[PDB]
Amino acid sequence: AAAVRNARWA
């Protein structure tokens, strides 16, 4: 599994 990387913008 993984943990949705939070390098996303807004």
Binding residues for RNA (CB under 7 A)? 1-10
* Shortest spacing between CB 4 and RNA, in angstroms: 3
Distance CA 10, CA 1 (A): 24
Distance CA 10, CA 2 (A): 21
| The residue to which tokens 């807004």 are assigned | 10
* Shortest spacing between CB 5 and RNA, in angstroms: 4
Looking at residue 2, what DSSP letter applies? -
* Shortest spacing between CB 1 and RNA, in angstroms: 6
